[PDB]
Design a protein around this ligand. Sequence first.
Ligand code: NI
Ligand code: NI
Ligand code: NI
Ligand code: NI
Ligand code: NI
Ligand code: NI
Lengths: 101, 100, 100, 566, 566, 566
Amino acid sequence: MIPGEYHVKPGQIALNTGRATCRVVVENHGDRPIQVGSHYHFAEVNPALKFDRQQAAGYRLNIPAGTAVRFEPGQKREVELVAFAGHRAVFGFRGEVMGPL
Amino acid sequence: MELTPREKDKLLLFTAALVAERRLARGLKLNYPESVALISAFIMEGARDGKSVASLMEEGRHVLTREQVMEGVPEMIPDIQVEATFPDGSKLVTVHNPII
Amino acid sequence: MELTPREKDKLLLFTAALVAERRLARGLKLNYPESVALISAFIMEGARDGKSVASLMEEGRHVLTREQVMEGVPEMIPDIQVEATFPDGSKLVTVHNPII
Amino acid sequence: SNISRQAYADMFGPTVGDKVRLADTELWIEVEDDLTTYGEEVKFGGGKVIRDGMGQGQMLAADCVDLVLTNALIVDHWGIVKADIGVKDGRIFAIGKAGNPDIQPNVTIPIGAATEVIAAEGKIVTAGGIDTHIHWICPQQAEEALVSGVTTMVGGGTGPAAGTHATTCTPGPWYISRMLQAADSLPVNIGLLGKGNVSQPDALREQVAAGVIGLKIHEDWGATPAAIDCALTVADEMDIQVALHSDTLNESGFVEDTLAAIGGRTIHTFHTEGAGGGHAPDIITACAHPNILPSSTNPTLPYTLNTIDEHLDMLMVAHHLDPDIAEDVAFAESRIRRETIAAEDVLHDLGAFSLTSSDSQAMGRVGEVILRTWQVAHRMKVQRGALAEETGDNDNFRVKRYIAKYTINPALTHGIAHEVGSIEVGKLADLVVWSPAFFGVKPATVIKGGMIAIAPMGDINASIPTPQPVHYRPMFGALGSARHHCRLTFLSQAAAANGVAERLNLRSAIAVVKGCRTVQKADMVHNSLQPNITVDAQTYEVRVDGELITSEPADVLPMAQRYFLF
Amino acid sequence: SNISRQAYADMFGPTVGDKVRLADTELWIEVEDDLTTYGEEVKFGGGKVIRDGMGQGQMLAADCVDLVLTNALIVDHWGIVKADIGVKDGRIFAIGKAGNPDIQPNVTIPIGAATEVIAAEGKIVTAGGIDTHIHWICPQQAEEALVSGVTTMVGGGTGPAAGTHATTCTPGPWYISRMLQAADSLPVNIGLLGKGNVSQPDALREQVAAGVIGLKIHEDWGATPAAIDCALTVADEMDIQVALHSDTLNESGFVEDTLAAIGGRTIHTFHTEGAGGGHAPDIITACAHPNILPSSTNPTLPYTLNTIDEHLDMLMVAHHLDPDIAEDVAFAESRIRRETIAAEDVLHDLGAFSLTSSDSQAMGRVGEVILRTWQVAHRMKVQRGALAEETGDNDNFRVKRYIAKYTINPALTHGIAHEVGSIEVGKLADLVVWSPAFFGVKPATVIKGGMIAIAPMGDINASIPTPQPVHYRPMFGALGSARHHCRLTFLSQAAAANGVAERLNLRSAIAVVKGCRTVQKADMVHNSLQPNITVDAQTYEVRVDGELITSEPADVLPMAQRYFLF
Amino acid sequence: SNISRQAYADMFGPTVGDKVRLADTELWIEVEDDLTTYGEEVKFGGGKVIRDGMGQGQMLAADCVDLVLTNALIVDHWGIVKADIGVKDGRIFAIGKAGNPDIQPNVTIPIGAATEVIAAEGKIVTAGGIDTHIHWICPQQAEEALVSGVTTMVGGGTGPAAGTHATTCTPGPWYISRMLQAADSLPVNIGLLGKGNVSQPDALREQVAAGVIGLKIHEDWGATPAAIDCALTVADEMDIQVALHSDTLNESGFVEDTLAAIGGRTIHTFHTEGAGGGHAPDIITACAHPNILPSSTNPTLPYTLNTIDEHLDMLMVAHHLDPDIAEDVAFAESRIRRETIAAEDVLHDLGAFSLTSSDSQAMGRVGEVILRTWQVAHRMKVQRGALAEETGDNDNFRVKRYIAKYTINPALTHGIAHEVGSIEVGKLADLVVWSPAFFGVKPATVIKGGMIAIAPMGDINASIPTPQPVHYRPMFGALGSARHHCRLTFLSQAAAANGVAERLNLRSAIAVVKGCRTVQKADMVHNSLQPNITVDAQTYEVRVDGELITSEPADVLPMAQRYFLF
Ligand code: NI
Ligand code: NI
Ligand code: NI
Ligand code: NI
Ligand code: NI
Ligand code: NI
C-alpha cells in the first residue's frame, strides 16, 4: 500500500498525430550552448544554429510538450519538426513573421 | 532575544521534533509529520554544530530507516528541505529520499 | 509536515505539559494549569500508542494523586477532556475526577 | 513522436485508463476521459510551453482567462476527467483545452498576458466543500474548515453562549445584523440560520427580513408541532430552508406526529441517525419520505470501536444536561444506539442519506467532514464490495455518490447551487487542489473566488517556499478587501430587497438564496433512495424491506494516524 | 413542590443567605436578595424551561431582550443579588425576572424568538473594569487587559517611544488623530490623554479639539506650577479631566506648592503613594483634599516581601534614568519607601484612596489591576478584620468598597459614568462572567456591548468546546464591523462638535465625556474618606490623626501560584 | 563646564572623530560632523532637558514637529553625522538641532507640546530599505522584510501559484486590482509589476492602466527579442520601469542579441550575476552598459564555502524543473558558476553592480537583503583593504557605497526616489533605528510614515517593556486606519489619472512613479562604474580590462551564528 499511488496501464502515447513533419540537420556554430523548447518557432531560433531556416518555417520540435533539445558548441544533429496548427499565425520570437504563415 | 518571525517559526519545528523523538524512544513506528520533523530538527542542529551543507545532505539520509516508520511514509517523503544559520550564514539543505 | 491549526494547537498543550513534567520531577506540588496539561498530554500519547478510549478514561485517573498537587486543585478539576487521533480517528476522552 | 505511458503520467499526470489510489484508502478512481490533444499539453516553467507566441497568445484581458489550472484530474459528481480549468472574473469559465489558438489546435481556454498559472499535473481538483451544520461558537472554526477543504459554511450562533453551544440559531435582528457584519472578516462563504421555534409568524418573518437564509427548529427551544408548522408556513412564503432537530423526548408526540406536522413540506433533517438529536429511537425513518433531505453529523461516521464510548459525555456537555439528574442521563442514553449508528453507514452507501455535515463543537468536528465521508466510503467498499451501479474495475461511481454528499447536495438543499457546489461554468471558483497521497486530508491549495486563500507554506525567509516548517498560513485571498471580493454572504430574497447589505454596510459580494421549497429527495444527486425503512421500538434494529441493515465497527481507519501529529 | 437548599444551589446557583468564597481568598460574599419566584426560574437546555410557549414567549423583537443572562449572582457597588439580566440594543435593559408573561408570574425581562441565552447559574457577573492609567506602549496591551476583565482603557501614547515609555501622553493633533484611528482596531472602549505640560493655553485647546478626553501633567515634561495652572484652566473650560504626576524632585516647590497651584480645582492624582512618581516623600498627603481623586498604580499593591527589591531597576528603566549618574539613583531611591507602601494598603481599606489602575509597562502590570485589588482586600481582612460598616457575618461591604475602585469610581473621575462603570439600566452591556473558583483571576466570558468579545476556548476541531487546550481566543465581538459596533471611542465635547469622527472617518460608536470638573472626593462610591494625614519628613512615617498607619508584608498571596503556569 | 569624551559618548552617543564598529564586522564608521552646540543637547526623561519652558517651547502644533529623534547617528549615502531628526506630517522635516528657541541657541527643530520623543543617543538611524525583487508568494513576507529593516517592497505575484513561484508577475487587470486591494493590509509601501512577456502592446498598456509600476520580462514566459522590444516601447510611453530576467537557454540569441533588442533603452537587470537567471554564462557583462541598472539577488552574496552546494536543488524547485529530464538539469547547472559568483562580490565593491535585492522565496531570502549586503562589504574589506576613495582611517566611503545599494539606488531605478529612499527633507519618514551591536541584523525600532510599525517588545503584562521574552510584535503603525495613513501604494501615472484608487476604493495614501526612463548607470549613487568586462565562454573567467576578477569563499561570516537562535 502506497498512499496516492498510480496504476498506469502499460503502453505508449502517440504525439501530434496527423500532422506534417520534416527532418532537418542543425549545427551550432556558436561558442555557447543553445537549448530550444518544444513549441518555439524553429525558424527563429538563435542565429548561431545553422540549418535550412526556409524549411523550418511554421514548424516547432516534434517532441513531448515541455521538453527541449540542447546543442552544445559545435554540435550537429538531425531533428524532427512538426507543423504549427490553430490559426497558423506566428507572433513574437525574433519578430520575423508577426502574422499568418 | 529579539526573536524575528523566522526564529519563532523554527521553534515550532523544534517542538514538533520533540514529540517525534519521544515516540521513537517508546519504539513506535513514526508517521508522516513525525518523520519530517525529526529529520529536519537533526539538520538544524548539524548547522549549529558547524557541519557543511554537503555533509548534512548525506547524514540526513541515515536518521530514520524504513523499519522505523509506518507503511507508505518513505514514499510520502521524496525529499526534505530545511534552512538554518551555518557559520557562513543561512543555507538550504536538501536531503533526497531520506528514508530507505 | 502540512500542520493544520489543530495540530499546532496541540503543540501548545504538549509544551505546557513539558513544563509540569519537569516541576513534578523536582518534587513540587502541581498547580491548576500544570495538572490539567500533564494529564491531558498523558492521554494524547495513550491514543498515539493505540489504547482504547475506555482504557484511557480509567488510566487518566491515576496520573496524579491529591498529595502531588496544591490544596484545592483536585476540586478545581471535576473532569478533563482531550481529543487525539486514535487508530480509528479522532475520539474524545473524558476523565471524571482525575485527581483523588 | 511517442512517449511511454509511465513517463507521460510523470510529466502531465494520469490519462484515460490510469487508476489512482485515494490517499491510503482502498478506493481507486480511473480517468474516464482526457480533454487534451496529445503533444499539445500546456506546461509552465523554464523553457516550457506557456511562453509568448507559443502556449501564450496575444489577446487582451477580455479575451483570455485570469487563471488556468493545467492538467487537472477533476473529481466531481458528473465525472472523473483530465482537463485544463479556466477561471475568469472569479468564476469557472471553462473546462477544456488551454493554450494559444494561434499555433495550437482545439484551444477552448485562451492563455494570454493577463493569465496566471497553477500547475495541477499529478493533482486532483474538486469543488470546495459545503458544511450546512455550523454552530458559530467561535470564529476560529472558519480557518479550520477552510484548511480541510470546506469553502462555504451555513449555520447559526452568536459566539460561546449557551444557546449557540446547543443550537444553530442566531436569535433576532440585532444578533443577525451583528453576525452578518462579522462575516465579512471570515474567508468562507456564509449564510445564517435564525431561531425558528415560535408559534407567532411575524417573529419569524422579522428574522428572515433581517438576513437569515433559513430557520432552525431545535428541541432545546421546543420542537413542537405548532412551532414546526409555523416555521414551515413562513419558509413556504419567503423561499428559505428549515433545518430540523426533532423532539427526542417524544414529549409532544412520536416521529409520526412530527412527520404529520411537517405535512409533506420540504425540510432538511439534521443528524437523521439520531445521536445528535431526534425522536428516540426512530428518527432515522424520516429518510423514507420524498420531502425530507436527510444529513448526518460526523462523529458517528464511520462506525468504529471507540464510537459508543465517547458519546455519552459529549452529549451531556453539548446540551447542558446534568449527569446527576436521572432524567437527564436517561434521555442522553436513549440517543446513543449501536443499531442505528451501524445502519447509518450502509444507508449512506445506498444513497438513502444524502448529505454529511459537522455539527461543529456541538457533537461534531468542524475539520473532519470531508475526511470522515471518505472513511465511510472506504469502510463500505471493504464490507459490501462494489455498488450495483459500478461499471469497470474502479470505484468511480461510489466516489461520485460520496463527493456529492458534501458538495452539490448541501448546495441544492439550501438554495445556493446557482452560485457554488460543483465545478461547472458560471459558478464561483471555489476550488481545492489535492495531492493524491493526501486526498481528503491535507489540501495543497484552497482557492476562494479565484484567489488562493490558504495553503501550506514553508519557511518565510527561505530561498524557496518548500523548506520546513510547512504549515497552513492565510494567503492574499484572505486579506482585507481582496477577501471581501472573493467571498459571498448569502441573504434571503426579502433581506436583499430591503437593502440590508447597504444598511449594515456589508463589504463582501452578496448572493441570494432561492429554490429551497422546490427541492425534494429525488433531486439529491446520486443519493435519492427512499427505502421502506423500519426501526424496532424494543431492539432498535433497523430494517429495509424486512432485511436487517447493519455493519461492523472499524478498529483502524485510513486518513488517520499516518497523517496527523496528534 | 419542595427542594433542598443544596440541590437548589447546584441547579440554579446560590440564593438568599448562602455564602460564596471569592477564589482562594478569605473573602466571603452572602447573597443579599434574590429577584426570582421559586419554581419559576428559567433554565435553557434539552427539555428545560426556555422553549416555545413555555419560558419563551410570542412577542416580536421590539418587545423582548436580545440577550438574557440567567440566574446570575451580581456583585456591584449597589448590591450582591441573584437575578436575571436582560440586554437590549447593546445596553443593560433590566435586572429582574426573565421569562414568558403568558404563563409565568412577575416577568420583567421578556424572552422571545429574538433572545439569545447565556447560562449564568453558579457564576458571578460584574461590570467590566476601567483602567485609567494606560501607557499605549503596544497594542497587545488591549487583549491582555480584556482577558483580565477590563473593558475600558484610558491613557496616552504613540507606541514604544521614549515619551510614551515614561508618560501617558499622545502629543499633538497628528498623533492624536492617528491613535483615534488605530483605536477602531482594539476590542476595548478607549479615551486618550494629551500632553498637558505647557504654559500656553492654545497648545492645550488644540489637543482637546483634536480628540483627547483629558490632559496628563507629568514631571518628565515639567510638572511646574505654571504648567499645572495652565492645564487646569483649559480643563475648566472644556470639561475634560487632568491627571497628575507631580514634581518628585521638589524642584519648583514642595507638595504644598503644587496643591496651592491646583487651587482647589478638580484633579486626578496618579499613583498617590509616590513610588510611581510625585513629591518625595509626602505626595500621599493629597488624599486629604476634597478636590483630589486619588488612585494607586498596581506594583505596590499589596505590600509583600519582594516589593521593595524589584522596584529600583523597574524605576530606572521606566524613566530613562542612568544608574551611573548619582543624582539619577538618589531620586529613584527617594521614591521607594517601605513606610508609604505599607500605609497605602490601609488607606485603600479605609476608603481614602478611591481607584486602582495599572500604569501599563511603565511601573505597572496591565493584566493585574483586578487581581491585585482583591489581594489587597484579602490582606486587609486578614490583618484588620471586619470594617466598621460591615453588617452580618460576611465581607459584603468590603467587597462593594473594593469593586468600586476599578469600576464606577474611575468612570466618575473621567466623565464616562453615563456610559459605563456599573451594571445599571441604560449603560453599555460590558459584562464579565466569572466562576467563583476563578473570580478576579480568569474570566469565563467577557462581553463587550452585548456581544462576547473574548473567552476561554478549547480545541477548535473538537466535538465540544471544552477539550484541551483551553486558552483565551478572540470571539465575534472582536471582529471587524461587529467590533466597531460594540466598542466606544470617547471624545471631548469640542472634538465631537468639530466633526472629528467624520473627518478621521472613525468607524466605532462615539461617546462624549462630561462632568469631569464637578466630581469631588465626596462623590467616590464607598471611598470618600478625607483623613487628616501627615508624613514625617525624616522617617517617612504616615499618620492619620496622629496614629501611625502601617501594615505587614505578605509572604504568600491568593490568586497567585495556584492559577498561573508561569 | 567640561566633560570627558568617554562620559560624553555614554550620555549623548559618539561625536566628531569617534569611531563605531558595525555589529561584529570589521567595518568602522567615524562621525564626520555633529550639528549640536555642546551643552545644549536635548535629552528626555525624569528631570532632563525636554520640559516646559526649558527644552520644550510654547509654540502651537503648526510651529513644531510631531516627532523628534534625539542625538541620532545618521548613516546615509550623503554622510555619517550626529544630529537631531524632526518629523512632521509623516515626513522628514529637518536634520539639525532640536529644542526651544526661547532659551536655546541654533534651534532648527522646534519641540513643543505636540512633540513626541524617540531617544536615539547611542543608536544609528538609517532610511528604510527598498527591495525591488519581491515574489508575492505569501503575505507573511511583508512582516519578515519589515522586521529586517525593509519598508518598501516592489514585485509581483498572486500568492503561491506556479507563475508567481517562478516570476515577479501579477498577470492582468483582475489580479492587479485584487493585489492592490490586498496591499492596504500590509505595513510596507508597495508597487506591483505586471507580466511584460507579450508582443501585443495593448495587452501591456491595459496592465499599466490597471496599476502596475513596471513590467517583468521573464524567460519562463518567453524572454524573446520581440517581447523585450514590446515591453520597452510601452515603458517608454507610460514612464514605468522594466525588469529583466533574460534567456538563459540562448534559445532566441546570445547576450549580445538581447542587448541589441534593448537598443540602449533603460532597463533594470535582475540578478545580473546569472545564478538567478540569464544568458549562460555571460549575462554579467550587462553591467558595462550605460542604460543598464544592475542588481544582485541575495543567495550568492557573499561567496561562501556552502554557496555552490545549496544552489542546484534551490534552482530546480524555483523554476519547476524536472531532475529526471536531462535538459532540465543541464540548464540548471549552466547557471551555477563559481567564477561569476566570486566576481560578483568584487564588482559590488567596485560599484559596477548598483543594487541588492532578495528574490523572495524564488532563489532568495526576504529577510536577508540588508544583512547580506553588509557581509559582502566586510568580506571585501578583509580581502581587498581600503577603497581608492577612502579618506581617513575608517570605512566611511565603503559604507556609503553599500548602503546606497538597498536604499537610494533601488528608489531611483523604480521612479520612487521623490517619496522614499533616503533621509532627506520632504521624503516619507520611513526610518530604522539600530543599536550598533545589532546593526543590519535586528532593529531597535522600525518607523513607517512617522509612526512606529514594528519593534522588539517584551512581556506585555510586565512592569516595563524590557522583560523577556522579547520578540518582534506589530505596533500602532501597523493597525487598521493608522496603517493606511502611514503606507504608500505606488501607481503608474495612467492608473492614477484613470481613477483606479477611487474605483477599487484603496484606503492607503497613493504615490505615483516617474522618471523611470531617464535614469542611467551614471545616476546610481556611488555605484556608477561601467567596466570593460568580459567572460570567457569556456572557462567562465571574468576579466575587467584583461585582469582576472575573483575572490575567496568565506568559511565564517559576521552577522550570523552570534545573533540567531536557529
Ligand atoms: Ni441537533
Ligand atoms: Ni447542532
Ligand atoms: Ni507617573
Ligand atoms: Ni504612568
Ligand atoms: Ni529571475
Ligand atoms: Ni525572481
